[PDB]
Design a protein around this ligand. Sequence first.
Ligand SMILES: Nc1ncnc2c1ncn2[C@@H]1O[C@H](COP(=O)(O)OC(=O)CCCCCC(=O)O)[C@@H](O)[C@H]1O
Ligand SMILES: Nc1ncnc2c1ncn2[C@@H]1O[C@H](COP(=O)(O)OC(=O)CCCCCC(=O)O)[C@@H](O)[C@H]1O
Ligand SMILES: [Mg+2]
Ligand SMILES: [Mg+2]
Ligand SMILES: [Pt+2]
Ligand SMILES: [Pt+2]
Ligand SMILES: [Pt+2]
Ligand SMILES: [Pt+2]
Ligand SMILES: [Pt+2]
Ligand SMILES: [Pt+2]
Lengths: 247, 247
Amino acid sequence: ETFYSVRMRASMNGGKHISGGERLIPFHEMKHTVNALLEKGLSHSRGKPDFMQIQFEEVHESIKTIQPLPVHTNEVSCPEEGQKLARLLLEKEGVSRDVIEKAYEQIPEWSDVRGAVLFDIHTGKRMDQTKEKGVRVSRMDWPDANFEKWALHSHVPAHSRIKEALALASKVSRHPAVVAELCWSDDPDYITGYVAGKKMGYQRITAMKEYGTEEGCRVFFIDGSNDVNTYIHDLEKQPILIEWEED
Amino acid sequence: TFYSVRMRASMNGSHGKHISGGERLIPFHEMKHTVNALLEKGLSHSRGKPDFMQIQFEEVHESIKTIQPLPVHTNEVSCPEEGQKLARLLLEKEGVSRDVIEKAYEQIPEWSDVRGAVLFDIHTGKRMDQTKEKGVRVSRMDWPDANFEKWALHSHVPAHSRIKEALALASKVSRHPAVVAELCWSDDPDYITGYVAGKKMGYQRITAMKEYGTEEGCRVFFIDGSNDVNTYIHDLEKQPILIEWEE
Ligand SMILES: Nc1ncnc2c1ncn2[C@@H]1O[C@H](COP(=O)(O)OC(=O)CCCCCC(=O)O)[C@@H](O)[C@H]1O
Ligand SMILES: Nc1ncnc2c1ncn2[C@@H]1O[C@H](COP(=O)(O)OC(=O)CCCCCC(=O)O)[C@@H](O)[C@H]1O
Ligand SMILES: [Mg+2]
Ligand SMILES: [Mg+2]
Ligand SMILES: [Pt+2]
Ligand SMILES: [Pt+2]
Ligand SMILES: [Pt+2]
Ligand SMILES: [Pt+2]
Ligand SMILES: [Pt+2]
Ligand SMILES: [Pt+2]
């Protein structure tokens, strides 16, 4: 009854990143999961790939189980309104306005980062040295049956895109060096994003960009005296399962 | 357009004891079936269940050469020591000097861990490649099943995919002008038939090359060429070949 990390990446054609996925599962779900990842890479709205890697490996570290972040959905009528709300939420979560503004000026240049960017709240600058690779959070997952119940109860659609985002966001927010996350999709067909943090949980914002744009974003705002490589190793390696508790 | 699809699997981490490997060359619309076949093949291998696996695909741009399989002849022997003796004889008849053969047989035991093939230079009486435990992995060859089944029927050989794969590989490799001979037997404890292959005598199966239950296998290509080893490695890894038999 050991668990397995299963990862996928796909690209078209410096190939254009198409898709990526990370799962953490018991062995008997291997076929379904390899197939799900396969399908997800093949039928992606960003294009059809000519390169793909799928990989699995046994996880030896013990698995921590946590609840998902509390969720609140902020209806907005347009992107400029959502982005404005997001900047306000980041501030209320503890990021200084100047650090936010500095980050927003560089977000456009980070659109091609395949993973996430780490931004130091002390130095007002990018902290990681992974460049276009970014920091890829992995070994987190949310068993589907539990997620469906959570969706039902939370009156949210049971879209796997939400399951994956919230699993990621809950793992990342747990890290003591992470004050906040800002995310929206690089998929032209999906405009909802979020801001997430310990105090205000997972704050969905229903419009963060215009349809048809392919620029997405993932930034983790970091407050830590420790070195960045420690934080990177935690985000990449530490296994997390989400389990929401009905009571 | 065609796609190279590759798999490797190991136990006790990645390349750890090598469990399985596979290489396919297919049109895009056979991707799901082929990813699944490779998955299945790694999961149910007689050498153990893996705790690591990689499956990968990529578009092939080089144009595809189609060739006939090597002529086949089956040598019945009563024991391993006899098959090995016959194999040494066949290698000599194919053009390898006795001294080079003996030198190779002294090293074969330490090469059991090589995940791919070993290249042995007839000019130096020594190993030619610098890949150590990785070895040289031949790929981008395949034999459409329908055609293979006919060939098996007509040749009075069992239509086992293990033979399809070995003969596809041996035919690609023997075509390379710098390859005088190949010596192979399986690293699978349940399969004791091996072969020697070359241009003059084709694909010579030897029905006993080791004792049942041993996991030491072998794959050595004897090289006589005027070029550097990296060229030959690139040819073996990169030249796309489909087998198509005709009477
Ligand atoms: N595992 C990861 N680790 C770090 N960054 C990642 C990871 N996966 C994706 N990213 C980065 O995040 C960017 C966005 O990727 P995507 O998968 O397109 O992101 C989304 O779908 C976000 C959806 C949030 C709203 C869901 C909801 O309705 O509640 C992508 O470009 C990468 O830069
Ligand atoms: N694609 C490759 N490229 C280079 N070396 C390879 C490759 N595939 C396998 N090898 C090497 O060969 C070794 C064993 O390969 P296996 O897949 O175990 O090979 C076999 O089943 C051999 C079949 C013998 C003849 C079949 C028959 O006519 O009845 C393996 O451990 C590697 O070291
Ligand atoms: Mg094989
Ligand atoms: Mg084998
Ligand atoms: Pt493209
Ligand atoms: Pt394309
Ligand atoms: Pt607040
Ligand atoms: Pt083992
Ligand atoms: Pt094992
Ligand atoms: Pt001969």
